[PDB]
Design an enzyme around this catalytic site. Structure first.
Site, PDB file in Angstrom:
ATOM      1  N   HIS A   1       1.109   6.093  -2.540  1.00 37.86           N
ATOM      2  CA  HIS A   1       0.119   5.118  -2.931  1.00 37.86           C
ATOM      3  C   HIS A   1      -0.168   4.815  -4.102  1.00 37.86           C
ATOM      4  CE1 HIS A   1      -1.172   4.453   1.444  1.00 37.86           C
ATOM      5  NE2 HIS A   1      -2.073   3.603   1.137  1.00 37.86           N
TER       6      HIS A   1
ATOM      7  N   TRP B   1     -11.361  -5.835  -2.282  1.00 39.26           N
ATOM      8  CA  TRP B   1     -10.227  -6.345  -1.373  1.00 39.26           C
ATOM      9  C   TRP B   1     -10.237  -7.964  -1.510  1.00 39.26           C
ATOM     10  CZ3 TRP B   1     -11.549  -1.457  -0.973  1.00 39.26           C
ATOM     11  CH2 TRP B   1     -10.744  -0.552  -0.660  1.00 39.26           C
TER      12      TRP B   1
ATOM     13  N   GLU C   1      -2.083   8.912  -1.361  1.00 37.03           N
ATOM     14  CA  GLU C   1      -3.274   8.058  -0.746  1.00 37.03           C
ATOM     15  C   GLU C   1      -4.393   8.644  -0.930  1.00 37.03           C
ATOM     16  OE1 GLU C   1      -2.867   7.211   3.492  1.00 37.03           O
ATOM     17  OE2 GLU C   1      -3.939   5.408   3.133  1.00 37.03           O
TER      18      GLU C   1
ATOM     19  N   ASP D   1       0.719  -1.267   0.029  1.00 34.53           N
ATOM     20  CA  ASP D   1      -0.057   0.031   0.086  1.00 34.53           C
ATOM     21  C   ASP D   1       0.823   1.262   0.158  1.00 34.53           C
ATOM     22  OD1 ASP D   1       0.650  -0.700   2.763  1.00 34.53           O
ATOM     23  OD2 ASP D   1      -0.724   0.761   3.402  1.00 34.53           O
TER      24      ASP D   1
ATOM     25  N   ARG E   1       5.228   4.706   6.267  1.00 33.91           N
ATOM     26  CA  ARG E   1       4.854   4.668   7.503  1.00 33.91           C
ATOM     27  C   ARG E   1       4.930   3.075   8.128  1.00 33.91           C
ATOM     28  NH1 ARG E   1      -1.081   6.219   5.484  1.00 33.91           N
ATOM     29  NH2 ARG E   1      -1.801   4.050   4.675  1.00 33.91           N
ATOM     30  N   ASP E   2       4.151   2.878   9.361  1.00 31.48           N
ATOM     31  CA  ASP E   2       4.400   1.824   9.838  1.00 31.48           C
ATOM     32  C   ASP E   2       3.012   0.797   9.228  1.00 31.48           C
ATOM     33  OD1 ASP E   2       1.903   3.281  10.777  1.00 31.48           O
ATOM     34  OD2 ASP E   2       2.503   2.665  12.996  1.00 31.48           O
ATOM     35  N   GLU E   3       3.278   0.491   8.104  1.00 30.79           N
ATOM     36  CA  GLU E   3       2.459  -0.227   7.182  1.00 30.79           C
ATOM     37  C   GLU E   3       3.179  -0.897   6.279  1.00 30.79           C
ATOM     38  OE1 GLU E   3      -1.233   1.834   6.635  1.00 30.79           O
ATOM     39  OE2 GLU E   3      -2.345  -0.204   6.211  1.00 30.79           O
TER      40      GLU E   3
ATOM     41  N   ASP F   1      -6.055  -2.583  -3.255  1.00 34.34           N
ATOM     42  CA  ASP F   1      -4.998  -1.700  -3.847  1.00 34.34           C
ATOM     43  C   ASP F   1      -4.531  -2.228  -5.206  1.00 34.34           C
ATOM     44  OD1 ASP F   1      -5.177  -1.030  -0.776  1.00 34.34           O
ATOM     45  OD2 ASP F   1      -3.800   0.641  -1.353  1.00 34.34           O
TER      46      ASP F   1
HETATM   47  O1  LIG Z   1      -6.733   1.376   6.665  1.00 30.02           O
HETATM   48  C1  LIG Z   1      -7.156   0.538   5.558  1.00 30.02           C
HETATM   49  C2  LIG Z   1      -6.637   0.913   4.350  1.00 30.02           C
HETATM   50  O2  LIG Z   1      -4.921   1.009   4.445  1.00 30.02           O
HETATM   51  C3  LIG Z   1      -4.399   1.626   3.281  1.00 30.02           C
HETATM   52  O3  LIG Z   1      -3.010   1.784   3.418  1.00 30.02           O
HETATM   53  C4  LIG Z   1      -4.745   0.875   2.153  1.00 30.02           C
HETATM   54  O4  LIG Z   1      -4.341   1.518   0.999  1.00 30.02           O
HETATM   55  C5  LIG Z   1      -6.240   0.277   1.764  1.00 30.02           C
HETATM   56  O5  LIG Z   1      -6.391  -0.476   1.222  1.00 30.02           O
HETATM   57  C6  LIG Z   1      -6.830  -0.125   3.316  1.00 30.02           C
HETATM   58  O6  LIG Z   1      -8.310  -0.178   3.199  1.00 30.02           O
END
Ligand SMILES: OC[C@H]1O[C@@H](O)[C@H](O)[C@@H](O)[C@@H]1O
Ligand SMILES: *[C@@H]1O[C@H](CO)[C@@H](O[C@@H]2O[C@H](CO)[C@@H](O[C@@H]3O[C@H](CO[C@H]4O[C@H](CO[C@H]5O[C@H](CO)[C@@H](O)[C@H](O)[C@@H]5O)[C@@H](O)[C@H](O[C@H]5O[C@H](CO)[C@@H](O)[C@H](O)[C@@H]5O)[C@@H]4O)[C@@H](O)[C@H](O[C@H]4O[C@H](CO)[C@@H](O)[C@H](O)[C@@H]4O)[C@@H]3O)[C@H](O)[C@H]2NC(C)=O)[C@H](O)[C@H]1NC(C)=O
Ligand SMILES: *[C@@H]1O[C@H](CO)[C@@H](O[C@@H]2O[C@H](CO)[C@@H](O[C@@H]3O[C@H](CO[C@H]4O[C@H](CO[C@H]5O[C@H](CO)[C@@H](O)[C@H](O)[C@@H]5O)[C@@H](O)[C@H](O[C@H]5O[C@H](CO)[C@@H](O)[C@H](O)[C@@H]5O)[C@@H]4O)[C@@H](O)[C@H](O)[C@@H]3O)[C@H](O)[C@H]2NC(C)=O)[C@H](O)[C@H]1NC(C)=O
Ligand SMILES: *[C@@H]1O[C@H](CO)[C@@H](O[C@@H]2O[C@H](CO)[C@@H](O[C@@H]3O[C@H](CO[C@H]4O[C@H](CO)[C@@H](O)[C@H](O)[C@@H]4O)[C@@H](O)[C@H](O[C@H]4O[C@H](CO)[C@@H](O)[C@H](O)[C@@H]4O)[C@@H]3O)[C@H](O)[C@H]2NC(C)=O)[C@H](O)[C@H]1NC(C)=O
Ligand SMILES: *[C@@H]1O[C@H](CO)[C@@H](O[C@@H]2O[C@H](CO)[C@@H](O[C@@H]3O[C@H](CO)[C@@H](O)[C@H](O[C@H]4O[C@H](CO)[C@@H](O)[C@H](O)[C@@H]4O)[C@@H]3O)[C@H](O)[C@H]2NC(C)=O)[C@H](O)[C@H]1NC(C)=O
Ligand SMILES: *[C@@H]1O[C@H](CO)[C@@H](O[C@@H]2O[C@H](CO)[C@@H](O)[C@H](O)[C@H]2NC(C)=O)[C@H](O)[C@H]1NC(C)=O
Ligand SMILES: *[C@@H]1O[C@H](CO)[C@@H](O)[C@H](O)[C@H]1NC(C)=O
Ligand SMILES: *[C@@H]1O[C@H](CO)[C@@H](O)[C@H](O)[C@H]1NC(C)=O
Ligand SMILES: [Ca+2]
Ligand SMILES: [Ca+2]
Ligand SMILES: [Ca+2]
Ligand SMILES: [Ca+2]
Ligand SMILES: [Ca+2]
Ligand SMILES: [Ca+2]
Ligand SMILES: [Ca+2]
Ligand SMILES: [Ca+2]
Ligand SMILES: [Ca+2]
Ligand SMILES: [Ca+2]
Ligand SMILES: [Ca+2]
Ligand SMILES: [Ca+2]
Ligand SMILES: [Ca+2]
Ligand SMILES: [Ca+2]
Ligand SMILES: [Ca+2]
Ligand SMILES: [Ca+2]
Ligand SMILES: [Ca+2]
Ligand SMILES: [Ca+2]
Ligand SMILES: [Ca+2]
Ligand SMILES: [Ca+2]
Length: 863
Positions: free
Chosen positions: A761, A527, A740, A460, A464-466, A473
């Site tokens: 994103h 998703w 994003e 995504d 960041r912390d992801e 996506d």
């Molecule tokens: O918090 C949920 C979202 O996080 C995002 O970074 C993703 O782009 C999305 O797919 C997701 O629904």
């Protein structure tokens, strides 16, 4: 006039240590030959000690043809050449340049006595793992001809043999769903060995295997809690016998200069703790600890399907400036993904800090939207001359870097700091530019967002912390992605993990893959639909029937057993749904609070998945299934209409997404009601001053929907808007990536107040496919591009555009321009072994079937 430019196996760029013993073969053509088609080919296969065999096939196929020889064994190299014969009996290729193909270690037994090892140093409890150095010395006391290193980590690794780095892969082996599938790498280390004594040293970091991953603080030790190494060095002697040097309890281990190295938080490196010579013989290993075995099932080990993560490019420093409070800030001019390389001298024990951000805010680097990701590296100098450093087991997404503690001894400039661009090293295939510099920059920004987020898995975001494999996506973006780069092997691997994860999630797809969230997530449209949509698109792009068949079970089980249904077969209306996420009208704190009903959106995507599954079934000659899904699609189309479309053809929500979905998915009861809805869509867009009104559910399809109904001019007007929300707003705000949110930055420069805000994103970048297919005119008319549609639709005050796509056959391209209604000029390049349909613009525009070559069209007085 005609040659073979590339010979490749499966979807591999190069084929060392592959999983296939009967790899399929493909060749791409180069040349300007006219109306050329293949009638036959020859494949030469050379095995050491044997005369080459030549295998001839009467066949027009040049893509994913069968391996023609006996199956390759583990570690067995073949050398291959191809030549191709033309149907006219007049133009044949020379033999291709030779390429090699060699399987890896195909069974557990092929690993010999190699086991996963760990340090006798205790692992940390409830904390990040300091990297561990592992070392072994060995002897090669016979003449040798070749050598291989087979290696992976429970973590990430960097290997050295006699102080030479092994390979050029970084962040290796990448992020798999490790409990199901764990990639290992193969390297040709022939030239790194020497006669007599040798040493191997490997540094292991936590990576994804044991690092802190996830948002809201994340979780560590997800796959295991202990850094581990698996390694086998195989040396082939002159007489054909082999030496095996396994990872085992004979190795020694130690900490080293890396204090910590974490995906999110960054790397602390203390150069005072370097142990020079540790990867060479004659080393003082006093104070090194032992090693022990970790239980590990070798059945999960797999060869990569796609390319590794590499240091793909350098990006030079653009500027150094002072912040509002006098801090030193680097500007690289581009929001990129990777890390810094420094070359610096300074005082022993002085620490330099590097804080990486995407944007500035309020005159300082903006760390706030990184959440619980520090993206901060620390380098402690040794004062032992000029030092060079890059981090080992972290990465960052950034344009700016605040630098503290930089030594006076070294000037801070392009000779002492540069950015390293890091991503999965796919072959570049697709290019676009046009006369409008903002739209050309938009495409560059999409390209950079793709580069930032194709990092082992399709992420995504990278900062960041992801940085998770968010399913929706990639569903939205893959039509775009698969044109810009050859994503086939990359997505093949990802989709294997998606399937494994689904099979332990009651046939539903977890939100992210690899799945770090367990089994609690309920099934969602878009998703979850990725398990259908990404395979369908992959087949449209690359035409691989084998891969479509392996992906079929995931798609079918999703529709059959994953989706949660109401009594008439639509979605259960009590389910959580993402649906049209990040609609520009949703509140910043509640991105799912869209203007379009979540179940209207979900049901539209259920119909779309059912349609795709019918079509995939037909492609795969699964007749019972194809008819079944055709039947279900018709019955559920009636239920969709009953639920969401009034008798006179009005949608329950007359919004950009609410209209675009039933238009693109053909869900109206009549062509007339659909045409009326298309005109209402254009009216809603016009009344909104052509500002985008879609979230994730609508955006990737909006341009294609308008063009499907002859309303390309309306979309051009949207594409040219520069006020928020729109694509070019992000460009004129000095964006160098897609964001994003439409409004990740507000017009005065403030960051969106939403806690979830990223400047990198690819979802909004899904407009790229419209640039490719409509401005550039190029789309596949048959899955895999052996038949091409060339249907340029000029508009938007563009004077010219150039688009190129490296198909599996060779280069396709359009270059068009206007002058002198208008005079339209087009040069269309069609590769050998393909055919195209050229649809010239305007009312009653001529349609023309063409074969390979360079075709020029001049259309006077186009209306
Ligand atoms: O918090 C949920 C979202 O996080 C995002 O970074 C993703 O782009 C999305 O797919 C997701 O629904
Ligand atoms: C999965 O595969 C399916 C099947 O290939 C595919 O659906 C087709 O998509 C193509 C476009 O790519 C559509 O072709 C266009 O059709 C236009 C005319 O449409 C009308 O007539 C259609 C044919 O009717 C006969 O045949 C069918 C099938 O045997 C039969 O059921 C009928 O009774 C009849 O005998 C008819 O299918 C179609 O109905 C759809 O749309 C209506 C209206 O909204 C909707 O109410 C229905 O529920 C249904 O979804 C409609 O009645 C035609 O004018 C058009 O021609 C233009 O474009 C082409 C190229 O696109 C140009 O060459 C040409 O010059 C024109 O500019 C084009 O041929 C086709 O209609 C679809 N077929 C069906 C059955 O849906 C899906 O898209 C695939 N899914 C995915 C995800 O890819
Ligand atoms: C930099 O620019 C910033 C943006 O212009 C500016 O902040 C703005 O300041 C102005 C003037 O004070 C405020 O204007 C007032 O707004 C209210 C109406 O506010 C409500 O609606 C707006 C817009 O909502 C719609 O559009 C957004 C996308 O733009 C969608 O997400 C949304 O769903 C709607 O479709 C909305 O942004 C506001 O939301 C913020 O504020 C509320 C509290 O009011 C919070 O709960 C929420 O989390 C969010 O922070 C709000 O719902 C109106 O009634 C007044 O008449 C006036 O028009 C802007 O609201 C405000 N924007 C923000 C984001 O704070 C900064 O001050 C400026 N900074 C500097 C240093 O110059
Ligand atoms: C045509 O398209 C439809 C819809 O996409 C497919 O229908 C699905 O078919 C499968 C079987 O092939 C069904 O799965 C089976 O469901 C049983 C339970 O069903 C009830 O509960 C569910 C969930 O709440 C409802 O959706 C359903 O309507 C029922 O009320 C299970 O008992 C079955 O399990 C047993 O068999 C399986 C093998 O499949 C074993 O693994 C198990 O151990 C067990 O012994 C099974 O799970 C599914 O429910 C159907 N879905 C829907 C929506 O109707 C067709 O398969 C498809 N046909 C073709 C040819 O493509
Ligand atoms: C197939 O799916 C099932 C269901 O999800 C899955 O079994 C589950 O596995 C997880 C591990 O992924 C188990 O979760 C653990 O639960 C215990 C308490 O019972 C917690 O203490 C654990 O959290 C701590 O440890 C984690 C790992 O170090 C840390 O990351 C975390 O921060 C905590 O410190 C952890 O949550 C779960 O209990 C089972 N559930 C059931 C019902 O069995 C199974 O593993 C899946 N199969 C495969 C092959 O993946
Ligand atoms: C979109 O359309 C739906 C369906 O008509 C609207 O939802 C209905 O709203 C009415 C009035 O508030 C309620 O009585 C119904 O119970 C709702 N039905 C459903 C299925 O939710 C909805 O308000 C419209 N807008 C949005 C954003 O969803
Ligand atoms: C008819 O169309 C109007 C819009 O013109 C719409 O609001 C209404 O919901 C429709 N009524 C029926 C019964 O279809
Ligand atoms: C964009 O860059 C220009 C200088 O090229 C600057 O004047 C302007 O403030 C920048 N805009 C933003 C939003 O940072
Ligand atoms: Ca050549
Ligand atoms: Ca060429
Ligand atoms: Ca010919
Ligand atoms: Ca022979
Ligand atoms: Ca083929
Ligand atoms: Ca000897
Ligand atoms: Ca070699
Ligand atoms: Ca410290
Ligand atoms: Ca030293
Ligand atoms: Ca530039
Ligand atoms: Ca390193
Ligand atoms: Ca300079
Ligand atoms: Ca289920
Ligand atoms: Ca609301
Ligand atoms: Ca239909
Ligand atoms: Ca249809
Ligand atoms: Ca505010
Ligand atoms: Ca098709
Ligand atoms: Ca068309
Ligand atoms: Ca390819």
């Amino acid at each position: 006039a005609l040659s073979i430019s590339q010979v490749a196996f499966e979807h591999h760029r190069t084929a060392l240590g592959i999983g296939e013993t009967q790899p399929r073969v493909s060749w791409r053509f180069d040349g300007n030959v006219s109306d050329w088609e293949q009638r036959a080919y020859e494949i030469e296969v050379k095995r050491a000690g044997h005369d080459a065999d030549v295998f001839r096939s009467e066949s027009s196929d040049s893509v994913l043809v069968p391996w023609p020889s006996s199956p390759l064994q583990s570690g067995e190299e073949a050398t291959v050449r191809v030549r191709s014969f033309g149907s006219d009996g007049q133009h044949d290729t020379p033999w291709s340049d030779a390429v090699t193909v060699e399987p890896g270690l195909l069974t557990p037994d092929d690993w010999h006595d190699a086991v996963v090892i760990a340090s006798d140093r205790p692992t940390e409890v409830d904390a990040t793992h300091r990297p561990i150095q592992f070392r072994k010395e060995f002897s090669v006391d016979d003449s040798y001809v070749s050598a291989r290193l087979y290696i992976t980590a429970l973590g990430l690794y960097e290997a050295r043999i006699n102080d030479q780095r092994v390979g050029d892969h970084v962040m290796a082996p990448g992020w798999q769903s490790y409990q199901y599938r764990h990639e290992y790498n193969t390297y040709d280390v022939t030239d790194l060995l020497k006669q007599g004594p040798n040493a191997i040293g490997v540094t292991v970091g936590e990576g994804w295997y044991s690092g802190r991953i996830g948002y809201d603080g994340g979780k560590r030790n997800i796959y295991g809690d202990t850094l581990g190494l698996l390694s086998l060095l195989v040396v082939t002697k002159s007489d054909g016998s082999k030496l095996y040097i396994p990872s085992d309890s004979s190795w020694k281990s130690s900490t080293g200069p890396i204090i910590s190295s974490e995906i999110y938080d960054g790397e602390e490196y203390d150069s005072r703790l370097e142990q020079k010579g540790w990867s060479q013989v004659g080393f003082n290993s006093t104070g090194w600890l032992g090693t022990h075995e970790l239980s590990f099932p070798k059945e999960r080990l797999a060869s990569p399907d796609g390319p590794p993560v590499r240091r793909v490019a350098e990006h030079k420093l653009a500027n150094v400036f002072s912040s509002a409070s006098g801090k030193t800030v680097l500007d690289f001019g581009q929001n990129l993904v990777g890390w810094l390389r420094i070359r610096v001298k300074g005082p022993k024990g002085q620490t330099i800090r590097f804080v990486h951000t995407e944007v500035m805010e309020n005159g300082e680097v903006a760390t706030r939207p990184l959440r619980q990701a520090k993206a901060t590296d620390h380098f402690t100098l040794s004062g032992e001359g000029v030092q060079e450093w890059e981090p080992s087991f972290t990465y960052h997404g950034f344009r700016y870097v605040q630098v503290d503690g930089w030594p006076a001894d070294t000037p801070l400039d392009e000779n002492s700091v540069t950015a390293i661009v890091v991503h999965s090293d796919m072959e570049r295939t697709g290019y676009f530019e046009c006369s409008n510099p903002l739209i050309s920059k938009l495409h560059e920004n999409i390209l950079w967002s793709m580069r930032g987020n194709f990092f082992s898995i399709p992420t995504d975001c990278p900062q960041r912390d992801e940085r998770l494999g968010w399913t929706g996506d990639i569903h939205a973006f893959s039509r775009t992605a698969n044109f810009i780069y050859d994503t086939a092997g990359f997505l093949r691997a990802w989709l294997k993990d998606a399937r494994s994860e689904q099979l332990n999630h009651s046939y539903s797809l977890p939100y992210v893959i690899p799945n770090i969230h367990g089994n609690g997530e309920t099934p969602t449209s878009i998703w979850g639909d990725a398990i259908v949509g990404v395979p369908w698109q992959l087949y449209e792009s690359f035409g691989d029937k084998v891969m479509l068949e392996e992906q079929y079970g995931g798609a079918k089980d999703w529709v059959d057993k994953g989706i949660v249904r109401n009594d008439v077969g639509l979605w259960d209306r009590s389910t959580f749904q993402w649906a049209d996420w990040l609609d520009p009208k949703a509140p910043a704190d509640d991105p799912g609070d869209a203007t379009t009903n979540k179940y209207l959106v979900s049901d539209a995507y259920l119909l779309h998945s059912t349609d795709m599954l019918a079509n995939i079934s037909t492609s795969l000659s699964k007749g019972e299934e194809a008819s079944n899904y055709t039947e279900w699609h018709a019955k559920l189309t009636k239920e969709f209409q009953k639920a969401w479309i009034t008798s006179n053809g009005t949608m329950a929500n007359e919004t950009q997404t609410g209209l675009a979905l039933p238009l693109y998915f053909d869900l109206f009861p009549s062509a007339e009601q659909a045409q009326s809805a298309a005109k209402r869509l254009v009216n809603i867009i016009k009344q909104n001053d052509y500002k985008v009104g879609t979230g994730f559910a609508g955006t990737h399809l909006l341009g294609h929907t308008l063009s499907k109904y002859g309303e390309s001019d309306a979309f051009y007007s949207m594409l040219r808007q520069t006020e928020v929300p729109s694509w070019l707003y992000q460009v004129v705000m000095n964006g160098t990536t897609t964001w994003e949110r439409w409004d990740s930055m507000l017009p005065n420069g403030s960051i969106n107040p939403g806690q979830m805000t990223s400047f990198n994103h690819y979802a909004v970048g899904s407009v790229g496919s419209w640039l490719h297919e409509v401005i550039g005119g190029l789309s596949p008319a048959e899955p895999g591009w052996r038949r091409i549609n060339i249907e340029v639709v000029p508009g938007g005050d563009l004077q010219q555009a150039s688009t190129k796509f490296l198909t599996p056959y060779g280069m396709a391209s359009t270059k068009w321009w206007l002058d002198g209604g208008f005079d339209f000029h087009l040069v269309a390049e069609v590769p050998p072994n393909t055919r195209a349909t050229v649809v010239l613009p305007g009312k009653g525009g001529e349609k023309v079937d063409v074969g390979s070559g360079v075709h020029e069209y001049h259309v006077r007085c186009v209306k």
